Amino acid sequence: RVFFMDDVE
Amino acid sequence: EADLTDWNLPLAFMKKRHCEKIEGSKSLAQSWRMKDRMKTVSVALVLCLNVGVDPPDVVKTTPCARLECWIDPLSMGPQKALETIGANLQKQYENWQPRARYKQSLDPTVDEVKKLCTSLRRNAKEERVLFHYNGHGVPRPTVNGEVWVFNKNYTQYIPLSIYDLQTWMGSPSIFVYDCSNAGLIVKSFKQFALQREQELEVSMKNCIQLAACEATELLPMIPDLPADLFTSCLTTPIKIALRWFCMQKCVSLVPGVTLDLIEKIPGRLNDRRTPLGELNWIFTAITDTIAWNVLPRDLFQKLFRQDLLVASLFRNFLLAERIMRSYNCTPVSSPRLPPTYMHAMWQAWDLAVDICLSQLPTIIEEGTAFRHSPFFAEQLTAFQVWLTMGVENRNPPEQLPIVLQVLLSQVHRLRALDLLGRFLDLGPWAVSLALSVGIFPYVLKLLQSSARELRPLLVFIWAKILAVDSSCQADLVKDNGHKYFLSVLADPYMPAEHRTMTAFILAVIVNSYHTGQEACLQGNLIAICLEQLNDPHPLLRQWVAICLGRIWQNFDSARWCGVRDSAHEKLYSLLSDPIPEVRCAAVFALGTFVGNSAERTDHSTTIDHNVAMMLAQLVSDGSPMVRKELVVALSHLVVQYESNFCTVALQFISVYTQIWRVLLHLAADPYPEVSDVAMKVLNSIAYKFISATVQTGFCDWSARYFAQPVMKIPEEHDLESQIRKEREWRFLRNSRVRRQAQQVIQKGITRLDDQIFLNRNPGVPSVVKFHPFTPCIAVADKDSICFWDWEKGEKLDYFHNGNPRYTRVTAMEYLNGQDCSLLLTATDDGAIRVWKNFADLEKNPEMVTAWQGLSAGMVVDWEQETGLLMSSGDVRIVRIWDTDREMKVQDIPTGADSCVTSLSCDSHRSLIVAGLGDGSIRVYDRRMALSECRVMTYREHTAWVVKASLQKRPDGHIVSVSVNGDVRIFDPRMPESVNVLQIVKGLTALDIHPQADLIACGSVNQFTAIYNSSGELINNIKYAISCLAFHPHWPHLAVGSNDYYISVYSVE
């Protein structure tokens, strides 16, 4: 992915 | 006043299923999908810095600019400085693309660069390779298209042709130039690409270039900024951005901020909770917003959404352009990006940086707590403000990428998801825009979160996305999001609306998708649906039934699972559901369950027969859509048992015979579409291939519901809407009409001999019905239905009711007379059909619904207040049809051999009366049991009862008249007649007026007596009169003789 999604479980 | 009465009247046959045509919405060409995913497997860093020696071309100033990659070369020796600069640049690039083969080249020779580029291309033949060049230590590129590098002895700069440079490289590659005349390099690259294209006849779009300056322009030499400026912007945007901000006059607004404090800024680029991470996040969001708002959709997807490294490079290139514009420096890129230095988002960036770094002195000295920036909260507030009045398809909001960015973190995740769901609720265009921005992968990743508060928002968003675009089923199954949806649907505590939302999502996931069907079957979705099948919610039951139908569509394992769970037996209950939509869904599910027998054991045959018989009792259904779904189910049955149906058909030229009879009944259906489908199905059996199978659009029509907005208030509730204003005007007109009629009646009744108009009709006027308020009368003929007016005196419409020759239109009624009136036309054979737009200028005749009733002619009596419809005829049965549920509610036996010649009821009471051919006038009260429904039965006539009408007054007086012409007024509380009158020896037709007790009779000798309830002679009009009708409010009477003439009479 282009960005970094955090705090996903 | 009388207004309250009109408002609280249900509008029969006025709903989505009746107005909108039952069909699936055409799927738009969804291009939000990414075509390919490139990766920068390797990166080439060519650094021709020439530390310790100044190029002859440019005479550097005494202070000059000595900062390259945030390193001062002169303080640590030439070779050591060069090596550390290379390592630092590699670290900076790894900050964005940690996984890539970085091969630094420090002051290389043409052969060294050749070998490096060839090796990198061989390693990654079809993946992007970044080529970084620094021409700070070498002379400027020449117009001929050459780049200067060093020889072995470092005594002379040897050129390197761009032609050979790209010959060594490959088509997939991106070039970053940091030179003085980098625009010259870009121009030479483009010219060489054009030369290659010309030569090929007898790699221009694939290659991407980032240049520090235009051909003419020179790099800045200001001592404060780094010498390596373009690469600093591209790779370390935040540090250079903060330095540049600290170099501007805006610092005057914030005293006590200096570059020294910037050097000691706490936090890192990753932890978004720290000031530096928050600043990096804000910068990323602002650059993404600028790119999305400014660049076109295709270029934005190609550059800022293809791969991480290129997207980051261009996002930082926006900042590079903004920074270097102030120094008479114009960066150049291979795809010409429209300028972004004046975009309004840079002001927001400056404000955010100011607010963030205004607290820096306190953090450094006092060690206070860092308060998070309100930038994201303010942007989401702006997005909410836009949504407040964003119903119109105006310019898209500029905060969509901001919402995308804030979705990443958890601080404002709930509000971001709520706002995104609200935006998607706007319509399919909103969801297309959202998916184009690139929310799909991140929303998909959200399903991995176990936070119980995200389930409603996530299911709303995913239901919208699946409604607009059904190709997301593969992605959802791949990521195992169907497990998340099943967990959502398995929670009784969840609100019903979100549960049906998830049911729709699951139905779309398994819609003609074997992988998804298997995944859901292994998820016990059959049991989950069954447990939630009897829930008190129409839409939830409908969509659970649809999901069950789609699960076992051409899937034997799902059918076996349902049989083990007794799915068909439990689903049988929905066949009696009052809501027609749930009945249609259940019929579709049962048909799909039947259609995949695939020649299993005798138990399969028995279950198939049981389902066939349970569906075969659904022929007598009021909803044409449910009958069409039934016809599809029997078509599936036929396909499963083609040979048996063929044998049964050839037999007549006992299970399958019953289904054949049902299909024949559906073939002669009043609704043209159902009849056509049934006839096509039967013809598919006569010539006995796969092409004969037809699938209705009911499922897609239901799926269309989630595409339309749900959150916003319905238009009906809108007080100032045009539709409600028109309805209010119509109700005011109706109230005025009633008041005028009452005033006229209060003045008494005078002789009525005025002939408003005399005309000629193509056929025999059989039944004439007056529209209560608007000046229109519907006259039905043997093969047509005319609509005439007594004010303009012009023929408005001429229908063909559609019934065959032997049949005839017997009864007629005006549904929803107060407003949006329909016309119910019931033929002698039982076919009841409803017409719309029958007296409109710009609208053609339309059929709303129709359904074979029953099965003297046939008599119909509509009751608007309670919404019931009662039919009777030659049969000994008085059926009670409910238009709300579209099912026969009660079946009261007539208990007489003779046919029901007339039928009427008293409002607000159950006093169904019925004139009989023998002469008896029977009264029925439906409140009590069917066996005791009969109340009174008095026989004082021996003839066909022309009209046993009833007065709407509380003291109802059944004015029953037979062919003998003797009037006998009866009461429901007296078994004997109260008034006995004799009028005409031979009577043909008559009508009665409830408000004014005027009984209009006919005669064979052209006489037309309009007498009173007391029998007093009033008029004897001199001209077979086979149709009389009284306007329900006015004292208007229509007379149609055997000759095809129509006249209406009034009192002065």
Pair B136, B260 in one domain: yes
Q: How far apart are CA B685 and CA B692, in angstroms?
A: 9
Pair B880, B992 in one domain: no
Q: Do A5 and B442 touch (CB under 8 A)?
A: yes
Q: Provide, as residue numbers in chain A, all residues whose Cβ is less than 8 Å from the Cβ of B441.
A: 1
- Give B902's strand partners: B915
Contact (CB, 8 A) for B737 and B1031: no
Q: How close are the terminal C-alpha atoms of chain B, in Å?
A: 28
Q: Do B407 and A5 touch (CB under 8 A)?
A: yes
Structural domain includes residue B1031: yes
Phi, psi for B385 (deg, rounded to 5):
-60, -45
Beta-strand pair B900-904/B912-916: antiparallel
- How close A7 comes to chain B (CA, Å)? 6
Q: What tokens appear for B656 in the block?
A: 């399958």
Beta-strand pair B877-882/B868-873: antiparallel
Contact (CB, 8 A) for B370 and B360: no
State whether residue B281 sits within 8 Å of chain A by CB: no
Contact (CB, 8 A) for B628 and B670: no
- Give B992's strand partners: B999
- How close B309 comes to chain A (CA, Å)? 8
According to the 3-state scheme, what is the secondary structure of B401-430? HHHHHHHHCCCCHHHHHHHHHHHHCCCHHH
Contact (CB, 8 A) for B781 and B761: yes
The count of structural domains within chain B is 3
Q: How far apart are CA B445 and CA B424, in angstroms?
A: 18
Q: How far apart are CA B283 and CA A3, in angstroms?
A: 13
Q: Of B1017, B913, B925, B1009, which is closest to residue B969 (Cα–Cα)?
A: B913
Domain finish residue from B954, B976, B998: B976
Handedness of CA B218, B224, B228, B232 (dihedral sign): negative
Pair B932, B1006 in one domain: no
Helix (H) or strand (E) holding B767: strand B767-770
Contact (CB, 8 A) for B174 and B206: no
Which residues constitute the domain of residue B865? 854-976
Q: Of B977, B967, B974, B1041, which is closest to residue B1004 (Cα–Cα)?
A: B1041
Q: How far apart are CA B707 and CA B692, in angstroms?
A: 31
- DSSP summary character for residue B495: -
- Contacts of B731 by beta carbon, 8 Å cutoff, 6+ apart: B3, B6, B7, B818, B819
Handedness of CA B385, B391, B395, B396 (dihedral sign): positive
Contact (CB, 8 A) for B70 and B232: yes
Q: Provide, as residue numbers in chain A, all residues whose Cβ is less than 8 Å from the Cβ of B451.
A: 9
Among A1, A7, A9, the residue with its CB nearest the CB of B442 is A1
Contact (CB, 8 A) for B991 and B1028: yes
Domain finish residue from B308, B341, B374: B341
Among A2, A5, A6, the residue with its CB nearest the CB of B305 is A2
Provide the 10 A C-beta neighbour count for residue B102. 18
Pair B768, B906 in one domain: no
Strand order of the β-sheet with B174-178 is B101-106, B40-47, B128-134, B174-178, B208-211, B332-333
**CATH number for the domain that contains residue B862:** 2.130.10.10
Q: Looking up tokens 């099965």, which residue turns up?
A: B855
Handedness of CA B831, B836, B841, B843 (dihedral sign): negative
Structural domain includes residue B347: no
- Give B981's strand partners: B967
Q: Do A8 and B449 touch (CB under 8 A)?
A: yes
Classify residue B594 as left (phi > 0), alpha (psi -120 to 50) or beta. Answer: alpha
**Which resolution, in Å, applies to this structure?**
3.5
- Contacts of B637 by beta carbon, 8 Å cutoff, 6+ apart: B591, B594, B595, B608, B612, B659
- Alpha carbon distances (Å) from A8 to A5, B448, B487: 7, 7, 17
Alpha helices (runs of H) in B65-144, residue ranges in sequence order: 78-94, 110-123
Phi, psi for B709 (deg, rounded to 5):
-65, 145
Pair B310, B186 in one domain: yes
Structural domain includes residue B991: yes
Q: How far apart are CA B272 and CA B370, in angstroms?
A: 12
- Find the residue in A nearest to B311 (Cα): A2
Q: Do A2 and B308 touch (CB under 8 A)?
A: yes
Breaks (C-N over 2.5 A) in chain B follow: 202, 653, 688, 855, 1023
Rg (C-alpha) for chain B, rounded Å, is 42
- How close A3 comes to chain B (CA, Å)? 7
**CATH number for the domain that contains residue B109:** 3.40.50
Coil, helix or strand at residue B564: helix
Q: Of B454, B463, B94, B266, which is closest to residue A7 (Cα–Cα)?
A: B454
Q: Looking up tokens 């939630």, which residue turns up?
A: B532
Among B408, B413, B450, the residue with its CB nearest the CB of A3 is B408
Among B304, B311, B408, the residue with its CB nearest the CB of A5 is B408
Q: Do B448 and A9 touch (CB under 8 A)?
A: yes
- How close A4 comes to chain B (CA, Å)? 7
Q: Provide, as residue numbers in chain B, all residues whose Cβ is less than 8 Å from the Cβ of A8.
A: 445-446, 448-449
Structural domain includes residue B54: yes
Q: Provide, as residue numbers in chain B, all residues whose Cβ is less than 8 Å from the Cβ of A7.
A: 409-410, 413, 449
Q: Looking up tokens 């509610």, which residue turns up?
A: B889
* Full DSSP string of B289-338: HHHHHHS-HHHHHHHHSS-HHHHHHHHHHHHHHHHHHTTT---EESS-PP
Q: How far apart are CA B663 and CA B634, in angstroms?
A: 8
Pair B940, B1028 in one domain: no
Q: Looking up tokens 């114009």, which residue turns up?
A: B330
Q: Do A6 and B450 touch (CB under 8 A)?
A: no
Q: Provide, as residue numbers in chain B, all residues whose Cβ is less than 8 Å from the Cβ of A4.
A: 408
Provide the 10 A C-beta neighbour count for residue B710. 14
Number of residues written out for chain B: 1052
Q: Provide, as residue numbers in chain A, all residues whose Cβ is less than 8 Å from the Cβ of B307.
A: 2
Pair B879, B955 in one domain: yes
Contact (CB, 8 A) for B916 and B856: no
- Find the residue in B nearest to A3 (Cα): B308
B843-861 burial, b for 16+ CB within 10 Å, e for fewer? eebeebbbbbbbebbbbbb
- DSSP summary character for residue B71: B
Strands (E), B453-608: none
- Find the residue in A nearest to B409 (Cα): A6
Q: Do B311 and A7 touch (CB under 8 A)?
A: no
Pair B1039, B1006 in one domain: yes
Coil, helix or strand at residue B720: coil
Q: Looking up tokens 């235009």, which residue turns up?
A: B214
Contact (CB, 8 A) for B850 and B833: yes
Pair B56, B45 in one domain: yes
State whether residue B407 sits within 8 Å of chain A by CB: yes
Q: Provide, as residue numbers in chain B, all residues whose Cβ is less than 8 Å from the Cβ of A3.
A: 284, 404-405, 408, 442
Domain finish residue from B961, B976, B991: B976
**Distance, C-alpha B115 to centroid of its chain:** 58
Q: How far apart are CA B85 and CA B107, in angstroms?
A: 12
- Contacts of B238 by beta carbon, 8 Å cutoff, 6+ apart: B269, B276, B279, B280, B283
Contact (CB, 8 A) for B209 and B175: yes
According to the 3-state scheme, what is the secondary structure of B788-838? ECCCCCCEEEEECCCCCCCCCEEEEEEECCCCCCEEEEEECCCEEEEEECC
Pair B194, B123 in one domain: yes
Q: Of B465, B455, B456, B453, which is closest to residue B423 (Cα–Cα)?
A: B465
State whether residue B658 sits within 8 Å of chain A by CB: no
B953-976 burial, b for 16+ CB within 10 Å, e for fewer? eeebbbbbbbbbbbbbbbebeeee
Q: Of B553, B535, B466, which is closest to residue B499 (Cα–Cα)?
A: B535
State whether residue B742 sits within 8 Å of chain A by CB: no
Q: How close are the terminal C-alpha atoms of chain A, in Å?
A: 17
Structural domain includes residue B315: yes
**Distance, C-alpha B354 to centroid of its chain:** 44
Interface of B with A in 704-733 (CB under 8 A): none
User: Could you give the count of Cα atoms lying within 13 Å of B365 in the half-sphere of its Cβ?
Assistant: 8
Provide the 10 A C-beta neighbour count for residue B462. 28
Q: Do B405 and A3 touch (CB under 8 A)?
A: yes
Q: How far apart are CA B514 and CA B510, in angstroms?
A: 7
State whether residue B449 sits within 8 Å of chain A by CB: yes
- Contacts of B457 by beta carbon, 8 Å cutoff, 6+ apart: B414, B417, B418, B420, B421
Contact (CB, 8 A) for B520 and B482: yes
- DSSP summary character for residue B480: T
Q: Do A6 and B445 touch (CB under 8 A)?
A: no
Q: Of B913, B853, B903, B855, which is closest to residue B882 (Cα–Cα)?
A: B853
State whether residue B436 sits within 8 Å of chain A by CB: no
Among A2, A7, A9, the residue with its CB nearest the CB of B409 is A7
Q: Provide, as residue numbers in chain A, all residues whose Cβ is less than 8 Å from the Cβ of B404.
A: 3
Q: What tokens appear for B400 in the block?
A: 């969509």
State whether residue B301 sits within 8 Å of chain A by CB: no
Pair B198, B80 in one domain: yes
- Give B42's strand partners: B101, B129
Q: How far apart are CA B135 and CA B455, in angstroms?
A: 54
Q: Provide, as residue numbers in chain A, all residues whose Cβ is less than 8 Å from the Cβ of B272.
A: 6
Among A3, A6, A8, the residue with its CB nearest the CB of B448 is A8
State whether residue B40 sits within 8 Å of chain A by CB: no
Q: Of B116, B193, B109, B183, which is closest to residue B151 (Cα–Cα)?
A: B109
State whether residue B441 sits within 8 Å of chain A by CB: yes
Q: How far apart are CA B638 and CA B765, in angstroms?
A: 44
Number of residues written out for chain A: 9
Q: How far apart are CA B466 and CA B705, in angstroms?
A: 12
Q: How far apart are CA B227 and CA B223, in angstroms?
A: 8
* Full DSSP string of B991-1040: EE-SSS-EEEE--TTS-EEEEETT----EEE-----EEEE-SSSS-EEEE
Beta-strand pair B1037-1040/B1027-1030: antiparallel
Q: Provide, as residue numbers in chain A, all residues whose Cβ is less than 8 Å from the Cβ of B450.
A: 9
Classify residue B304 as left (phi > 0), alpha (psi -120 to 50) or beta. Answer: alpha
- Contacts of B467 by beta carbon, 8 Å cutoff, 6+ apart: B428, B431, B504, B508, B703, B704, B706, B707
Q: How far apart are CA B710 and CA B694, in angstroms?
A: 31
* Full DSSP string of B649-662: HHHT--HHHHHHHH
- How close B96 comes to chain A (CA, Å)? 10
- Alpha carbon distances (Å) from B402 to A2, B240, B297, B462, B876: 14, 23, 17, 20, 72
Q: Provide, as residue numbers in chain A, all residues whose Cβ is less than 8 Å from the Cβ of B438.
A: 2
Q: What tokens appear for B991 in the block?
A: 């009508």
State whether residue B782 sits within 8 Å of chain A by CB: no
Among A2, A6, A8, the residue with its CB nearest the CB of B311 is A2
State whether residue B405 sits within 8 Å of chain A by CB: yes
Q: Do B445 and A5 touch (CB under 8 A)?
A: yes
Q: Of B790, B777, B773, which is closest to residue B738 (Cα–Cα)?
A: B773
Pair B1043, B899 in one domain: no
- Alpha carbon distances (Å) from B310 to B209, B504, B909, B937, B993: 11, 38, 78, 91, 84
Q: Of B1008, B946, B934, B931, which is closest to residue B972 (Cα–Cα)?
A: B934
Q: Do A4 and B408 touch (CB under 8 A)?
A: yes
Structural domain includes residue B623: no
- Give B879's strand partners: B871, B891
Structural domain includes residue B477: no
Q: How far apart are CA B288 and CA B314, in angstroms?
A: 9
Coil, helix or strand at residue B725: helix
State whether residue B515 sits within 8 Å of chain A by CB: no
The amino acid occupying position B654 is S
- DSSP summary character for residue B372: P
> What is the four-CA torsion angle of B460, B463, B464, B466, rounded to 10 degrees?
160
Structural domain includes residue B456: no
